[PDB]
Every structure is written in C-alpha cells, then in structure tokens.
From a paper:
Melatonin receptors (MTs) are family A G protein-coupled receptors (GPCRs) expressed in the central nervous system (CNS) and peripheral tissues and are targets for melatonin, the major neurohormone involved in circadian rhythm and sleep regulation. In humans, the MT family consists of two highly conserved members, termed MT1 and MT2, and they share 55% and 70% sequence similarity for the overall region and the transmembrane part, respectively. In this study, we determined the cryo-EM structures of active melatonin receptors engaged with the heterotrimeric Gi protein. The interactions between MT1, MT2, and Gi are mainly mediated by the α5 helix of the Gαi subunit, and the receptor cores comprise TM3 and TM5-7 from MT1 and MT2.
Eventually, the reconstituted ramelteon-bound MT2-Gi-scFv16 complex was subjected to cryo-EM data acquisition. Therefore, the three thermostable mutations, L108ECL1F/F1293.41W/C1403.52L, based on previous findings, were chosen and introduced into MT2. These three residues were located far away from the ligand-binding pocket and the G protein-coupling interface; as a result, their mutations minimally interfered with the function of the receptor in terms of ligand recognition and G protein coupling. With this triple mutant complex of ramelteon-MT2-Gi-scFv16, we obtained an EM density map at a global nominal resolution of 3.5 Å, which enabled us to model most portions of the receptor, the ramelteon molecule, the Gi protein, and the scFv16. The ramelteon-bound MT2-Gi complex adopts a conformation similar to that of MT1-Gi, with an RMSD of 1.4 Å for the Cα atoms of the receptor part, reminiscent of the structural similarity of the two receptors in their inactive states. In MT2, the corresponding pair N1754.60 and Y2005.38 also experienced conformational changes during transmission from the inactive to the active state. However, they take an opposite manner, and the hydrogen bond formed in the inactive structure disappears in the active structure. As a result, MT2 has a larger subpocket, allowing the accommodation of ligands with bulky R3 substituents, consistent with the molecular structures of most MT2 selective agonists. Interestingly, even though MT1 and MT2 employ a nearly identical set of residues for accommodating Gi, the bound Gi still displays slightly different conformations. α5 and αN in MT2-Gi have outward displacements of 1 and 2 Å, respectively, compared to MT1-Gi. When we mapped these affected sites onto the MT2-Gi structure, we observed clustering of residues around the Gi interface.
Author numbering:
A (entry chain B): 5 to 54, 182 to 232, 241 to 354
B (entry chain C): 5 to 340
C (entry chain A): 38 to 235, 249 to 323
D (entry chain D): 9 to 62
E (entry chain E): 2 to 120, 136 to 247
Write the structure that this text describes.
C-alpha cells in the first residue's frame, strides 16, 4: 500500500535519527542561568573563561558549560522565567560591598523571589559573593547597624561575612531539595571555575540518583 | 488632575454609550435553540520526535501540513496524514516562543527570546531550507507573528509595540503603539485589513493595517491575556484570560457579549481557537487538559484530556476537519 | 505450627506479589518516558516473579488442602520447573538491575556514548534464557520429587553433588558479590562528591535484604552437599521448614524494595489508579 | 506632558464611532452559525468513509 | 545545480568500465539518484536507483547483478560498475537527481551524457511517431498505459519529459497535472484512468523535440516509445 511513499518514510526515519543524535548530544552539556542585581558583579564571573539572551559557552575538565545571561531583557520576569525549567544550576552573584550604598535589601528580595519560586523547585542555587576586599576596607568605618539593626556581634570582616552568609541562607524555604553552595570570590581565576565545576558535579550525581530511584 | 479631567469625562461618555447600547443580553436571546449535546473526540494520530517542551504550532493552508516549535532547537514540518516528517530546520537561538506557516506554503517564520524574527525558504533550487532574512529592531522578546502576504508580516513583541514588516527590505513599514506592557497574542482578520492583539494589562485593542493607527480598545478582564483568536465571520473574537475566564467580545456592538467560566476551573487559558461554523469555542487550559465550549449556550460540552502536561498551543484546520493540540509533554496530538 | 505458618505466609505473599507486579507492568507501559530509561530490567523481574504467583503457589495450596500430593506425576515434574524459572529468574534480575544502576550513576559517558537505544529491550532475553539453559540439566539428572518433608515439590539437594553445587554458586555467591560491590561503589561515589562541594540504610541493605533471608537454605545445601551420606539425613525438620518459609517470603520482597518504596515509580501509581 | 494630550486625542477619536444594538449583532451571529452548521465536521459527526483520518 | 559525468569511451566486449557522476551546487546528501540510458536514435530506459543514505539499491531486470551502483556523500560523486558488454549494454548514460517528500517533484535536473561502443512491467506505450507542426495552434499528445496508474492515495504517478534535439531532456509535468518549475504556462496535462493527454496551447520555435513518459507506481520504471514533434 505504498508506491513511492517508501522513500518519504525513509527520509522521515533518517531525519529522525539525525534529530535523535542532535538531542543526545545536548544532554551532556550543563546549562547555568546567570542572575543577580549588579552588572559589575556579573562581569567578574563572566570574565573568567571565554539583544536578549547573551549566551557564552566554555569547556573545563572535559565538560561543556553553557551559561545564559538574561538580565538585558527589560520586561516582566514571570512571562518567560518558565523557559528555563530544566537548567542545571542558577548562578547568583550579589555584592558584599553594597550593604549601605538597602541595596543589599534589594538583592535579598531578588534572591527570595528567585529561590522559592513555583518553578526551580528542584534546582540548586550557587551563591557567589563579590567585592569582598572593598567590603573588608569599608567595614572598619561603617557599622552594620545602618542596614542591619539586628546585628549584635563585633565589627570585623570574619564575623560579618559569616553573618551575611547565614542571612542569605535563611531565606531558603525548601531545605530538603535545594543546596545553596556559597563561595567567596578571589583574584585567582582558577578557583571560581573549580568551585563551579565541583558544585555542578555534585548536582549531576543527585540528578542521576533521582532517575533510578535510590532515594 | 484638571488636564486628565477631560480624559475622565471622555471615558465617562464612552462607558455610558456602551452601557446604553446594551438593550438585551445574548444569553436570554439564545434560549430557544437546541443544545449541541455531548461531543466525543478521539485521538486519531500521535506525533513524536520532539524532546523539549512545545510552545507553538500553526496549521497549513491545505490542512495537511503543520509546523511546530520547541526548545530543542528544531523546527519540524509534520505531515498530518501519514505522520511523516517533511523538514527539520535547525535554529540558532533555542528559545523560540512562536511560529507561523505561510498562506502560500512557501515560507515559515519563528521568533523567541533573541528579539529576532527569521524567515525560512521551503522551496529552493537546492534541497535545503535556508534563511531568507532576519528581522531585527525589537527591544523585547518576540511573542507572536502571523503572516499577511508573502511580502508583508505582522509581529507582536514584549516591548509594548506591534509592528508590520517588509521581508524584501527588512525595515519596519509601520509601528503600532498604545499598549502599556507585554503585548502577548495577535490575530488578524480573514480579509487581512484589521488585526487585534492582547496585552499583559488585560486590554485588547484593534489596529487598522493601512491607516496604522489604533481603532478600538476592549476591557473587562482581571489578570492577563495569554492568547487570542478571531471569529470566522469577522465581527467578533474570543480572548483567553489568565483567570479561567474566556470572553467573547464584539466589534459592531463594541461591548463584551458573553463569558465562559466554571467554578471547578481555576487555572489560566493558554490558547483559544474556533471551528469552521463557529458553534464550538475550543480553549487550552493550564489544568493538564483542553476543553470545548458552546459559543452560544456557554456550557461545557466535552473534556479533551490525554495530555500529561499543560497544553501550550491549539489550532483548527482551514476545512474544520481536525483539531491539533501541543503541550509541554512534548507529544503533539491531532484529534477529530 | 508447620502447616499454619506455611499456608498463612504464602497466601498473603502471592496476594501482594501478583498485584504489585501487575501494577508495575502497567505502570511502565503507561508512560513513554519511563519505558526507555534502562529501568525495563525491572518489568522482567516483575514478570518472572509473578510467574511463580500464577502456577506454583495455587497448586501448592491445593496439595496442602488434601494433606498430601493430590495431582499426578505430570504436574509434579512441572510444578517444580516453573519454580526454577521464577526464583532463578528473580535473583538474576536483581543483579542485572544492580549493573544498570552502576553504569548510569557511576560512569555515564560510555553509557551515553555506547548508547542503550535498542540493546536494552533485547538484553532482558539473554540472561532470561540462560535461566533455562542452566536449568535444562535438571531433567537430565533425574532429580525432583514430592519430598513430603516440605509438602511443596522442590529441588532436592541429595540428588547430585554436581548440581547441588553449581546451583549454590551460580545462584547465591555471584548475585551477592555483584550486588554488594556495585551498591557499595555507588554509595562511595555519592558520599565522596557531597563533601567536596560543601548511609548503609537506604542504599545498601534494602537491596541485599534478600541475602540474609536466602542464606540459610544455601547453608543447608552446602552442608548436605559436602557429606550427602551422613550429614544430609541428620537435620532438624523445623530448620528446613523455616528456611523454605523464608525463601517463599522473599518472593513478595522483590516488589516492596524495588516497588512501593521508590520516588519515581510512586508518583505514577496514583495517576494509573 | 504631550503624551497625555496624545492619549486624550486617541480617546476622543475612539469615542466618535457608530454603535449597533446588541440584538442585531446577536441575530447576525446566530444566523451565521446556523446557516453554515452543515459544513462543520466537528459539530456533526462524519462517517469514516470520507474521514481523512482513520 | 550542475551535474558533470565522465568515464565514457570505446572498449572491447567483455570488459569493464567506470562512470562517475560529479554533483556540485546542491545538498547532494539528500537527493536520490538514478541512471537513465538512451540507445542511439531510440527511446529511454531506466537502469538503477540509489536512495539517500544508501539503503535501497533497486536495479533493472535486464542488468540485474552485472551492474553495481554506489555513492560517496562527502565527495559528492556517484559511481557505476559495469562488467562484460552486450548490444543492450551500450548506450548514452544520463545522471538524474530526485527527492521524495509530500510535495516534492522527482526528476528535476539531468546530466550531459556519455558514449560507449556499439548499438510484469507496466508497458506504457503510444507512439504516434511524428506530428508535423505550425507555430501557433494547439497540439495534443496522447498516451496509453498497460495498467491503472491511479493509486489509492488519489494521485497518478506519471511524468512527462521533453528532449530538445542537441541536449539533455527536462521535466514538464509531474502527476499529470502539476507544472514544473520554470516551464511556461502554455503546457497543460490531463487525463484519468489509463487515457492521458498532454496539450500545448501554442507552439513556439523552441518547443520542437521528442516527448517521453514515465510511470512511477512500481519499479522498474518504464519509458514510452517517444513521439517526435517536428515542423
Ligand atoms: C541450596 C540449594 C538450593 O536450595 N537452591 C535453590 C532451590 C530452588 C527452589 C525451588 C527450585 C526448583 C528447581 C531448581 C532450583 C530451585 C534451583 C535449580 O533448580
């Protein structure tokens, strides 16, 4: 019951195997959604290696990283955020310098709005912290009381960093599905990429375990 | 404000005229007509080959070919009779949000988060599908594009403005402004002289094509406008809100006519389409399944379940023979 | 005690087993996503452990009702060969799943380079025909009997030294070594990567809780195999009865440790029901 | 601001168009739906002999 | 969009020869390829067919086994292996492309030709031999088939070909109704069942040539006798 449709069926079966190969080539790559509030903070972490979505891809330790920057889009967040349902991780970079310059209060929201969203309920959030050195110099003269009336510890770099880390981690509402990996950025290039790779490797193993069902 | 006081009075008499011109409602008028009864629709074909979520599709002119767009990065032109794949177009930015298939069957266009609308040839001297021209000039994400001729198209983006393009040159022939945020949907009249579009501020507007200036606005919603359709007659349209309230507006009467709401449904409509006769109003709900409504009785007449995730696109062929729905399940189904 | 125990445990075992295995069978076929994920090694496990739920156990119950063998020799020679396709086919799929969840979790490049695709659908047949291949000599040796010591016809050990053994080795030792090596490397890998970024109770024992319950029977076997002339007759009857009670117990165990205590399969169970 | 004047002009252009009684539009819609109800394969079930999908 | 072939010559009977078809200017990795043979001052005849991603290597019955056809996608070249030599073996060989999907038009472009040494199947036949013409009026050409070509799909698989004197032929009408790309609209094909007719609205100077017919319902593809349209 097929005179010349057999060639069409062959074509449809070959442009099916080609599509299967193309789709199986795109599962090895890891997709990371870059986010934040400050453009300067994004720069340092987009610098390391190599309108609308501005993609940037790099390879490290035989792993293909695909990093998407979306901040450019000046529109409603809720109308396109669901397009990133399957992202492996959400890189989040905030500023430590800006505790005074309520700007951190702004970020603290953007972190709450993104973390416990209707989507992203099973995606880890890597938390970067930038401008730690300038924070160290400027914390001597500026007490945290202006922006953090609840602070009771001493005025030092070590205690302030731990306190702000705990404050950022407190806004998490799903402690049994997410893992907020926190790191303090340094001048060394290699360390940031190493931390990103180590965090991604842990997430990949957990995702693999979820498929089989060892939980 | 005294300056805005005159605009307040203008809104006053326009609302007064709309209220006064409504001497009778449609619901009591359509009382002696027999209901269509229960409608049974079954799955005739199921089409597989997409891997990521499906966001849009468009029926062809001959009602035999259809094109679908997905986040996988591939644009597939299905054959709706034997479930064969005709073409597989690899994209550049895998963030597509809409697609369109030419009335003449020669061109296919799609656009997404890259703010670029691309036109693809389908009948070339070589056996390849190439890019004719990429249209740029939008500062927001492109939401919906519908062809007009083989040389003129209309696009709807998230930058509050709709535009009419010109593929031969690539420059914006006309630009439509007046909405406040995130123009979501778009649909054009059968005679290709007027079109309407829904905005995220829950207010649909009617734009003329030759004049290039807005002609009329419609309000009454509460949350948003996810998708819009247009009645086959050309004097009305159906709009899909985000609070389980499909609404049928009117052009001559210039008023809201009838609403399609239920207490059980709480989700938001994702797509709306009509039938050839216009009796059935099909809607695609966020609640894992589609629905069909009587355009006059305003009562449910069948639940078209069978999907494992939210439907994102719905379309009815030109001859009114089949109904095809696409969902985030990544499976495309054609029903009868 | 004897007969009560027996009948009791076996009826509820069959009741849980058949329902769970049919539920899983229809669950996997229900979704296309579940199907081609390499987890179709477990539908073979469900089928091969529901086979013992159809033929053997009802005939065992019928024999229990008559307080002795009620059928003919024809059924006896077949009521212990369907058993040998199920049990041997159940402790060989729990070591094949133990291999699937070692190439997907650990490794994983070669797994996506050397694709599964169609290999897996035909891979549930080689080690499912090797069951009868390794069971074909069972008719040749001339073993099997009613064995009224248990009131359930089964593989009598005193028959040969050759097959008392081979059965002990190919069915016990390897399906323990493999499953205690793979499910240990998977746990080690998981725990070794969690600390760099920043427990023997859900990943290593639930999956070997068949060893602790199949061990006594294999111990009795080797015993009666090393000295089949003096050691075999001297054996408490209650010990053998309890060993076989435990052996029939595991049969439903392979549906409540790969079944209703998962997260991927538990979700679909509501929709299908 | 000039945008307010532009919006006022658009509103007053909008508020100067003809109106039609809702009964006439409803009758037109009902007539269109009834007259073309025979050519609707979705409204009226179609035998599988001429159904392109089987 | 250019097909170039070489490998023709004069050889002793019983030998072997190599013919290579070089394709440049299109996606050769997606077009099914055929070989068409034309005996001197005679008609056409199908030889072989090789699909895209070679999986079907359908052959003609008269050269089955003796001839071998192969393709090399990266280099974009078609190969033909011939062994021995007979009277029917030698003729002019053509290289034809074809793509098969829902709305495709097989047998689009044709090669140049080669030379060699010497001089059931639906038997489509008509042979009205020669029709003398005067530039201006309308002339119709009739064709008859040995079997009903109207498949259950609702379309008939017959193609019309025109070969001007001095170069390779080209396709005019596919599925007895659809015009080819680039041909003038004056041509018009029609018919049903087994009686098909091709009509030309007006005759021009360049319309002089020989008209051939194909059937594509089932392999092997059978040509017609060919009717010359002379002045
Ligand atoms: C210690 C030896 C032992 O108990 N082995 C499992 C005995 C099981 C139980 C029932 C049956 C029937 C046939 C058969 C086997 C068995 C093993 C090989 O062929």
């Amino acid at each position: 019951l097929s005179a010349e449709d057999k060639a069409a069926v062959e074509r449809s079966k070959m442009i099916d195997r080609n599509l299967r190969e193309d789709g199986e080539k795109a599962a090895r790559e890891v997709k990371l959604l870059l986010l934040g509030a400050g453009e300067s903070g994004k720069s340092t972490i987009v610098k390391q290696m190599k309108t609308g979505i501005v993609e940037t891809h790099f390879t490290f330790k035989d792993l293909h990283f695909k990093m998407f920057d979306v901040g450019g889009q000046r529109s409603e967040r809720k109308k396109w955020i669901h397009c990133f349902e399957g992202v492996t991780a959400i890189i989040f970079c905030v500023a430590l310098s800006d505790y005074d310059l309520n700007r951190m209060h702004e970020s603290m929201k953007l972190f709450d709005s993104i973390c416990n969203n209707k989507w992203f309920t099973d995606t880890s959030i890597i938390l970067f912290l930038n401008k730690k050195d300038l924070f160290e110099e400027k914390i001597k003269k500026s007490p945290l009381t202006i922006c953090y009336p609840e602070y009771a510890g001493s005025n030092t770099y070590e205690e302030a960093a731990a306190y702000i880390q705990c404050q950022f981690e407190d806004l998490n509402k799903r402690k049994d599905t997410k893992e907020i990996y926190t790191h303090f950025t340094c001048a060394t290039d290699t360390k940031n990429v190493q931390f990103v790779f180590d965090a991604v490797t842990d997430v990949i193993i957990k995702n693999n375990l979820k498929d089989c069902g060892l939980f | 404000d005294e300056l805005r006081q005159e605009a307040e009075q203008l809104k006053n008499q326009i609302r007064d005229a709309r209220k006064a011109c409504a001497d009778a409602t449609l619901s009591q008028i359509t009382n002696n007509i027999d209901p269509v009864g229960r409608i049974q629709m079954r799955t005739r074909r199921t089409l597989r080959g997409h891997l990521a979520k499906i966001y849009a599709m468009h029926w062809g002119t001959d009602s035999r070919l259809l094109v679908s767009a997905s986040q996988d990065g591939k644009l597939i032109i299905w054959d709706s009779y034997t479930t064969n794949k005709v073409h597989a177009i690899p994209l550049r930015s895998s963030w597509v949000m809409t697609c369109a298939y030419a009335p003449s069957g020669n061109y296919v266009a799609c656009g997404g988060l890259d703010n670029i609308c691309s036109i693809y040839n389908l009948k070339t001297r070589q056996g390849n599908v190439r890019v004719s021209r990429e249209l740029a000039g939008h500062t927001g994400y492109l939401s919906c594009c519908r062809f007009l001729d083989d040389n003129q198209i209309v696009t709807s983006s998230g930058d509050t403005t709709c535009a009419l393009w010109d593929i031969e040159t690539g420059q914006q022939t006309t630009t439509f402004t007046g909405h406040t945020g995130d123009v979501m949907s778009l649909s054009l009249a059968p005679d290709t002289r007027l079109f309407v579009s829904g905005a995220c501020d829950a207010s649909a507007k009617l734009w003329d094509v030759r004049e290039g200036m807005c002609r009329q606005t419609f309000t009454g919603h509460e949350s948003d406008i996810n998708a819009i359709c247009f009645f086959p007659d050309g004097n009305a349209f159906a709009t899909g809100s985000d609070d389980a309230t499909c609404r049928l507006f009117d052009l001559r009467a210039d008023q809201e006519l009838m609403t399609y709401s239920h207490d059980n449904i709480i989700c938001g409509i994702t797509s709306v389409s009509f039938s050839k006769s216009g009796r059935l109003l099909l809607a695609g709900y966020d609640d894992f399944n589609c629905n069909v409504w009587d355009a006059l009785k305003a009562d449910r007449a069948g639940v078209l379940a069978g999907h494992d995730n939210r439907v994102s696109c719905l379309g009815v062929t030109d001859d009114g023979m089949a109904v095809a729905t696409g969902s985030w399940d990544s499976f495309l189904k054609i029903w009868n | 005690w004897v007969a009560p125990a027996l009948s009791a445990v076996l009826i509820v075992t069959t009741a849980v087993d058949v329902v769970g295995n049919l539920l899983v069978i229809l669950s996997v076929l229900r979704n296309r996503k579940l199907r081609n994920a390499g987890n179709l090694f477990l539908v073979s496990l469900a089928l091969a452990d529901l086979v013992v739920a159809f033929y053997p156990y009802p005939l065992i119950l019928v024999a229990i009702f008559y307080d002795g063998w009620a059928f003919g020799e024809e059924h006896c020679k077949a009521s212990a060969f369907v058993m040998g396709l199920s049990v041997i086919g159940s402790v060989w799929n729990i070591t094949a799943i133990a291999i699937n969840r070692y190439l997907y979790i650990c490794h994983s490049m070669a797994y996506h380079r050397i694709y599964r695709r169609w290999h897996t659908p035909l891979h549930i047949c080689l080690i499912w025909l090797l069951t009868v291949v390794a069971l074909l000599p069972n008719f040749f040796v001339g073993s099997l009997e009613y064995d009224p010591r248990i009131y359930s016809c089964t593989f009598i050990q005193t028959a040969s030294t050759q097959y008392t053994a081979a059965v002990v080795v190919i069915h016990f030792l390897l399906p323990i070594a493999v499953v205690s090596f793979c499910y240990l490397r998977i746990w080690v890998l998981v725990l070794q990567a969690r600390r760099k970024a920043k427990s023997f109770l859900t990943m290593f024992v639930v999956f070997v809780i068949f060893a602790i319950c199949w061990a006594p029977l294999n111990c009795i076997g080797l015993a009666v195999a090393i000295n089949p002339q003096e050691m075999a007759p001297q054996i408490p009857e209650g010990l053998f009865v309890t060993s076989y009670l435990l052996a029939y117990f595991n049969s439903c165990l392979n549906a409540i440790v790969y079944g209703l205590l998962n997260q991927n399969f538990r979700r679909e169970y509501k929709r299908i029901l | 601001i000039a945008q307010a004047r532009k919006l006022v002009q658009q509103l007053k252009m909008e508020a100067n168009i003809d109106r039609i009684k809702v009964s006439k539009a409803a009758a037109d819609l009902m007539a269109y739906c009834e007259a073309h109800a025979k050519e609707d394969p979705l409204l009226t079930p179609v035998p599988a002999s001429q159904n392109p999908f089987r």
